From Swiss-Prot, chain A:
Distribution of this protein across tissues and organs: Expressed predominantly in cerebral cortex, hippocampus, cerebellum, adrenal medulla and retina with weak expression detected in non-neuronal tissues.
Paired cysteines (S-S): none
Domain t-SNARE coiled-coil homology: 2-64
Quaternary structure, from the entry: Part of the SNARE core complex containing SNAP25, VAMP2 and STX1A; this complex constitutes the basic catalytic machinery of the complex neurotransmitter release apparatus. The SNARE complex interacts with CPLX1. Interacts with STXBP1. The interaction with STXBP1 promotes assembly of the SNARE complex. Interacts (via C-terminus) with KCNB1 (via C-terminus); the interaction increases in a calcium-dependent manner and induces a pore-independent enhancement of exocytosis in neuroendocrine cells, chromaffin cells, pancreatic beta cells and from the soma of dorsal root ganglia (DRG) neurons.
Taxonomic source organism: Rattus norvegicus (Rat)
Annotated site ((Microbial infection) Cleavage): K63, A64
Role this protein plays: Plays an essential role in hormone and neurotransmitter calcium-dependent exocytosis and endocytosis. Part of the SNARE (Soluble NSF Attachment Receptor) complex composed of SNAP25, STX1A and VAMP2 which mediates the fusion of synaptic vesicles with the presynaptic plasma membrane. STX1A and SNAP25 are localized on the plasma membrane while VAMP2 resides in synaptic vesicles. The pairing of the three SNAREs from the N-terminal SNARE motifs to the C-terminal anchors leads to the formation of the SNARE complex, which brings membranes into close proximity and results in final fusion.
PTM entry text: Phosphorylated by CK2.
Cross-link (Glycyl lysine isopeptide (Lys-Gly) (interchain with G-Cter in SUMO)): K62, K63, K66
Classification of source organism: Eukaryota, Metazoa, Chordata, Craniata, Vertebrata
Subcellular location field: Cytoplasmic vesicle, Secretory vesicle, Synaptic vesicle membrane; Cell membrane; Synapse, Synaptosome
Gene this chain is encoded by: Stx1a
Family designation: Belongs to the syntaxin family.
Name recorded for this polypeptide: Syntaxin-1A
Swiss-Prot record, chains B, E, F, G:
Gene: Napa
Database matches in SUPFAM superfamilies: TPR-like (SSF48452)
Protein name: Alpha-soluble NSF attachment protein
Highest taxon above the source species: Eukaryota
Record localization: Cell membrane
GO MF annotation list: protein-containing complex binding; SNARE binding; soluble NSF attachment protein activity; syntaxin binding
From Swiss-Prot, chain C:
Protein name as annotated: Vesicle-associated membrane protein 2
Residues of the full protein shown: 29 to 89 of 116
Predominant subcellular localization, coarse grouping: membrane
Cytoplasmic topological domain residue ranges: 1-61
The gene coding this protein: Vamp2
Free-text tissue specificity from the UniProt record: Nervous system specific. A higher level expression is seen in the brain as compared to the spinal cord. Expressed in hippocampal neurons.
Length: 66, 286, 61, 131, 286, 286, 286
């Protein structure tokens, strides 16, 4: 029936693009996961290094009393 | 290495030295030691799953910490205490948190003041069931987040505020919140996708308005046929607005029946849609 | 026709999820940002302290 | 009309499959990164605790010094359905992962400030012992 | 707990000591204490929601910090001042922000300098509405990001630049940006997907184009019919190029209506499409 | 530059000083020196792909580090040792982790303790094949995560627990876990979705219940036709319940035969489906 | 206040003192002072967008820093130098990174070493175009990631290795890599979705084998026709294996044409497919 194959059309087009919008999110999100994935590249960097500077700080201070 | 043992030594340590004990010096050096003791106790208390004991233990170490002058790490201890009581059996879950924020607030730490401010409003609702005090917090908290330009969290909290404000009859005061968080969302081409629901909520929330507050909010919204995300916002709304302006509680209840297929209604929507269905019924046979 | 409307809401079901996920990336924006800057200014105040410590070393060692 | 309503829809179903499948790959990468980024944080946590423990040792010592078309078409539908219902699988997983790390970052930011303020105190309590 | 009082004490201690006050040493030790004072003041000013007052207070604490020799934590204060003024009634914000960058830049902290730089132009566009000064910043900032290896961010900024450059009429200066951000987007198979819109924009922007500058940007494009994503880029473009080269403000305005079906037109697109829509009419009428 | 050389210098100095050697002060720095030595050795061992040696070397540096006064950095070393032995060829990978957590646990650090606790159980299953101890760890660890109100991870662990607990024989102990992780899943509408599978698993797990434990668990479930997702949960379950209540080892095997089309049958489900398939035959001839 | 002046001062003090100017203690602080100078110089150089000069300046501060006795922050400076040259116009970006990893490696900081290692191989391929060395790095780096249990990363590197290995005729060593990264992919039910492509790659890569290395890899692959994902993996492969076993360079070129519909081929695939397409013809005529 035309009322079926037709309703199907407007429904499928309202099914694919319904994924479009969703697809757009995976686009932006993915672009953000990598974007914010940069800060972590610095976090890991800073953290360990911050421990290096502090470690040298706790050492000198201890030897400054001995 | 026994809990009670530590608690005891800790007690004998925590006390302004005087007379023979004080000798020549003292003060912070002792009270600090006691703090570390109680913390070490609270540790094994959370071990044996005593909680209550662990929480109160942290309360001890914390309060003592203040007696030394160290609000920072103290407040953090207050947090360990709050988390303890929360996931425990006694109360105090609310007190510890208030005692933590009173510190983070004055110390000039709003970033966190809001972090636990939301946890607070979350417990004062899911536990104490005090929506009227929860909203006050969700709100003031969003204010702080907005100050830190953390628009995101600011919105998280506002969404909570309005969301429960509607359940608390505060419909108009809710739509205002949706209007603000709705206008302060278009700026980001990443919230355009979410900006819908805001308009749907604001267009559903009715402070018993007789004019077209909704027929106007639906218009303020920009829609086109090629939308598929929109099919879950105004398309339905318009059909509900006509079903309200015509006292037809059959077109509204049938439309909620159809719409309840392509997109399920959460508890919130149901409660409000029901409230609107009642504004229609209570107006028809009458 | 059934399998059609059947797949519909199912897709939208994932769309509703991305929504929450999007709200998750925003949280990961506030944290990283401010924190990365604070922890970054840490090495600044930490390095200086290591410097002054060097002086305490050449006068007390 | 039923000829251009089904076919076009078929070319439409094709777009769906690829769009989701091509996005799922990005989803994998996302989860793949979420796992790695998770380790990078479990390595940051070690620092926060390390810094707060060492600074406590510094202060003490410091203060010390101080004081068939509809058939295959329908077949694709069964595929789309199985993929979407699967898109949630990761969508949910990536959710827990985030909520997890997000919580871990909270403990970091907190302690981070406590350590920062402390390192500053040490610096200030260090420029007052010289001489 | 008195802001006014703190603001006074801070003054009484923020002054190069001499005579019986200076003693043997001094200097930075005092001015720092003063900074802490004004900070505490701005803190309660924001507590009472006086913001403006809090902002100017932070301005004082910051300015003082410079007089101590500590550009780092100083600039951070300038930031706080900006967040205050922004979520306040005065307009100051911009100033503080500029004063922040000059520090992060001279210090070498370009990473954060750009982190804020983007927020700068973001305010000079959402507030002062001065795009001419916004683009300059989005650009100078993208240079820093692109220098910090950070390609993704650099592209975010470039997108801002070109995007608003076409609104200001700078079409060619926009297509160049789209071309570059397009060739530097394929090196990441995690961006190929979006590389479309870039070509679509670069081909839409017309500096009174008369030939095939766009037909050339659409031909350089590699569309894969079986790669359905492209259906939101070139396929339309070709039909528009024909509707342009054939002085037909109907085929173009009909194609915009159809494409507006399979793919919702956003603000930007709309504005530019209408501009091209009139370049045809005036040519039908010459 | 030679491992065997450093390993030698590291020993002749890692000895409690006394008498003339002690001189004036102790040797809290000696032990630390030895630690740095072994670290450098294990360091080059990992370069020579001699992993085993690197691991045992790290074990040395770690153990010595405890002989100083640094449980933190020690435990982390225990982790390095485990990483080595793990990617290496010998065992010890399990011991290093037990020791690591031992420290993180006595120190008061449960977050990280659980972080390695799950790693442990994950090794004790896919490697040592010790499901009976693995579950013990997945569980205790999930308890720690639950102690940190980190629902997210707590569930990740619980799923493992119940999942393998059902494979073993623990069906009731499994359903209980699914009930807990199910009730503690609805509070957060961000897990609403997954909540099905939990009910599907719990309803599949049968502790030899001849009743409607599952017919009742499926009745407790909130499906509603308008919602589609549920189709991959209870829908099948009902038919299976009928095929169980009628000792029909054909309708059940046909139901799973069809369901495997609309929904892929993972290993887990299969193993259990076959187990139920056996309960039916074991009731037909009993 | 310009770098040109600083570069000079940094030299007028970076000289070992002697006579009355020295006394007893050398000048371990002088060398450090010079390092700070060059850092300030490279800093404004980076401000002037000179880059080249900024990089070589950092190289100076770095080398001197080594002349002191601080390998850590030195190597970090080497990184700053590399980031400068990389974003700069000259070369040296490769040398600075070499001198960086030699330090992170001998020091034991493999975690970060691999981080810069991949950056290295990525530059030695996209720039210098030295695939033979790039692969050596992508690989060794993946080995390090494998040691850190950072599976996630290790695979990212292995994919690069195999990918560029198939272009260098290394077909067999490619399939091996895909097998490993394929076996270590199934364990994680979060990568099963990608494992397919792995099996497809490994099956496509042919080291001129006449047996059924691919017909075996495709069989080892667990698929279920009622699958959706798997259609983009073995299904095609089978048809290709038959078109290979029948010296028919027409059904293979036809099949690649059909599959090129449901999924448009990428760089790699196409490049290899043409290779197999030639193996068939080269198998016909001769």
């Amino acid at each position: 029936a035309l009322s079926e194959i037709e309703t199907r059309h407007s429904e499928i087009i309202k099914l694919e693009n319904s994924i479009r919008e969703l697809h757009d999110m995976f686009m932006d999100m993915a672009m953000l996961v990598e974007s914010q994935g940069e800060m972590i590249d610095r976090i890991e960097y800073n953290v360990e290094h911050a421990v290096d500077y502090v470690e040298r700080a706790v050492s000198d201070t201890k030897k400054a009393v001995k | 290495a026994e809990a009670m043992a530590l608690l005891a030594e800790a007690e004998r340590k925590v006390k302004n030295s005087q007379s023979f004990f004080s000798g020549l010096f003292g003060g912070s050096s002792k009270i600090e030691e006691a703090c570390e003791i109680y913390a070490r106790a609270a540790n094994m208390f959370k071990m044996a799953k005593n909680w209550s004991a662990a929480g109160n233990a942290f309360c001890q170490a914390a309060q003592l910490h203040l007696q030394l002058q160290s609000k920072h790490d103290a407040a953090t201890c207050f947090v360990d205490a709050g988390n303890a009581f929360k996931k425990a059996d006694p109360q105090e879950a609310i007190n510890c948190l208030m005692r933590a924020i009173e510190i983070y607030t004055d110390m000039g730490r709003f970033t966190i003041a809001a972090k636990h401010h939301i946890s607070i409003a979350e417990i004062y609702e899911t536990e104490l069931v005090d929506v009227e005090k929860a909203i006050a917090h969700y709100e003031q908290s969003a204010d702080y987040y907005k100050g830190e330009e953390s628009n995101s969290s600011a919105n998280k909290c506002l969404l909570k505020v309005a969301g429960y404000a509607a359940q608390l009859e505060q419909y108009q005061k809710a739509i205002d919140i949706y209007e603000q968080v709705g206008t302060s969302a278009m700026d980001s081409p990443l919230l355009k996708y979410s900006a819908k629901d805001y308009f749907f909520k604001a267009a559903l929330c009715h402070f018993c308005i007789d004019m077209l507050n909704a027929k106007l909010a639906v218009q303020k919204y920009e829609e086109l046929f090629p939308a598929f995300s929109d099919s879950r916002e105004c398309k339905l709304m318009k059909k509900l607005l006509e079903a309200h302006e015509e006292q037809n509680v059959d077109s509204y209840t049938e439309s909620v029946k159809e719409y309840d297929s392509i997109s399920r209604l959460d508890q919130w929507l149901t409660t409000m849609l029901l409230r609107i269905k009642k504004t229609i019924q209570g107006d028809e046979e009458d | 026709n059934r399998r059609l409307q059947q797949t519909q809401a199912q897709v939208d079901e994932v769309v509703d999820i991305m929504r929450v996920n999007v709200d998750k990336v925003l949280e990961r924006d506030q944290k990283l940002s401010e924190l990365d800057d604070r922890a970054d200014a840490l090495q600044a105040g930490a390095s200086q302290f290591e410097t002054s410590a060097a002086k305490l070393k050449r006068k007390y060692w | 009309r039923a000829d251009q309503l089904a076919d076009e829809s078929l070319e439409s179903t094709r777009r769906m499959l690829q769009l989701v499948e091509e996005s799922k790959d990005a989803g994998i990468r996302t989860l793949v990164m979420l796992d790695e980024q998770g380790e990078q944080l479990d390595r940051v946590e070690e620092g926060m605790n390390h810094i707060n423990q060492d600074m406590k040792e510094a202060e003490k010592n410091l203060k010390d010094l101080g004081k068939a078309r509809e058939n295959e078409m329908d077949e694709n539908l069964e595929q789309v359905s199985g993929i979407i219902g699967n898109l949630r699988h990761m969508a949910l997983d990536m959710g827990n992962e985030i909520d997890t790390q997000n919580r871990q970052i909270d403990r970091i930011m907190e302690k981070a400030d406590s350590n920062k303020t402390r390192i500053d105190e040490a610096n200030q309590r260090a420029t007052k012992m010289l001489g």
